[PDB]
Design a protein around this nucleic acid. Sequence first.
DNA 1: AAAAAGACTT
DNA 2: GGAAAAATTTTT
DNA 3: AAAAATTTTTCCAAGTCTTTTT
Length: 565
Amino acid sequence: QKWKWWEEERYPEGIKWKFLEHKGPVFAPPYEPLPENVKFYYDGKVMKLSPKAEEVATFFAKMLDHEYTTKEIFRKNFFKDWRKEMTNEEKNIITNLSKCDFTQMSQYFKAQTEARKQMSKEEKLKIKEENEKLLKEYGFCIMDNHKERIANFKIEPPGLFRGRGNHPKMGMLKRRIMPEDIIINCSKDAKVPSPPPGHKWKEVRHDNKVTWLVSWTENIQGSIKYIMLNPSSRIKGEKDWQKYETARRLKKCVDKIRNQYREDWKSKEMKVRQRAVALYFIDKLALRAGNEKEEGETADTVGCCSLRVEHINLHPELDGQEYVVEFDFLGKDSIRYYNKVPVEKRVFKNLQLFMENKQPEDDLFDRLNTGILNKHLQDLMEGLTAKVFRTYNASITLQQQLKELTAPDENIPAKILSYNRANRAVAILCNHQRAPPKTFEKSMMNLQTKIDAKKEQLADARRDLKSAKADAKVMKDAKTKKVVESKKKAVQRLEEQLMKLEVQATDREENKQIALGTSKLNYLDPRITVAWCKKWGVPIEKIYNKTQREKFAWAIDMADEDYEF
DNA sequence: AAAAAGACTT
DNA sequence: GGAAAAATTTTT
DNA sequence: AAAAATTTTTCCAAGTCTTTTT
Ligand SMILES: CC[C@@](O)(C(=O)O)c1cc2n(c(=O)c1CO)Cc1cc3c(CN(C)C)c(O)ccc3nc1-2
Ligand SMILES: [Hg+2]
């Protein structure tokens, strides 16, 4: 079939859909109690735990290998939640987590993991088929005239929360989501999904102002989780396409905005100076619009508008550079942002004023928040917000770098290296850093041995040609000449193979501490990539895999070699 | 407002 | 998403 | 065949911006 929704008339404002029907979520299988021979110990004595308490105990047992289970916060949160799950008799015996012995439970689960990787082809194939039919039955939904895939129709099973970074709620229990916690959304004329027998949905609504199918409240942060359509859908795709179109409009007025905030660094009002400086950071350094967050509820991370005095250090001179600002702080996902950046004199002077009479814990930009900044951006350009700058700067950088680095004569592998370097420049800018691949980085040794093996074949082929040429001199004829030809060809193929391996070796090295995934899927206008591929004859499958090819179908079909962001 | 909530994005 | 699993594939 | 290196799914959150409450 293949529906090209991008050729349809743009979907109106307000209403998200007219018709919506789906089968609801897929609940995680019920908890299976431990077999008789897997004992739990408390104070050195065997103790049978009721299903509810035993289940929570298995979560802790499966995480016994991780260092975070030794953490104070983790253990405090865990035991407090585990206690709520216990019967009154169990609560009287188990006064603390340290007297407990989860060793046998831990070994059992490891044994099941070994047993599973030893299953027969009959078992394995059968499990795969049950999944496929579950995908056909619950993985799709009908939205206005078309059938579309649902992203995460299977609700995540219960477990223990860990989060990212130093989270205050790690160790807490993510309780099992039940039909009773589920809010279903569908059209008034669709067939309403039936909850499992003996249960009822929390609510059944018909809200065509939203795009979700199922929603529920998660107990850790108290936020609402959703089941929405997949990236290849029209509702997600159209919104992504609009995001890039917004970034393009920003392109034709960014210099106007830059000239304005540069002047604003001189304004009589402090609020205006701070807003102008913040804008400068978001634009030049692509920092995020740090929305304030509740203290003690989330890991301590910050963005632009939430920077504290302690997050920057001013240096009149550093490394022979003038007016250097030293940024050091934890951003999203607790990823450390460290950068020494030379700034304009007026910005440096402004920052010194913003740090006057303040404590290290106080905000750098008092009198400033994301709401005020975005309100201003909305004045400059309709639909402009803080994050649009990240999309714009990432996209313009990719386009520009692809234009400057691609060599017309290079073979596909070399062009891919160029594409990857351009993507890498975007990643470094967005600070999408990564830690060296868990000792598995030594797989560089494997490539090195392969390159050395190839260098040996190439050297062998050189001696063949060297002796073929020598034999061509003595008794010069067209028969020996064709041998010199066939030897040269063999040297050529080997040189290309070597070149390809060396390029792959360089690609991996330069990409040791960088994560390309996020920019690739969220910050780069796919049309830029599509245009580049078509222009140089690089098969799109070399850049985008199957799932990515589905998400960006709109760009792949609607974008020629002459597309310009 | 300005927190609190909800609904998207990354 | 991106590190860890798991499924495959390649080396030996 | 059996260990080793890859390619491919499986697991699990945190921000931004808009919309309602208080
Ligand atoms: C790791 C980078 C990033 O945090 C980011 O901000 O750059 C992220 C994370 C996650 N996703 C992304 O697209 C991206 C990149 O843009 C999707 C995603 C889904 C996750 C789900 C699945 N949900 C949505 C059902 C979890 O349950 C828990 C953690 C998850 N983390 C992520
Ligand atoms: Hg960026």
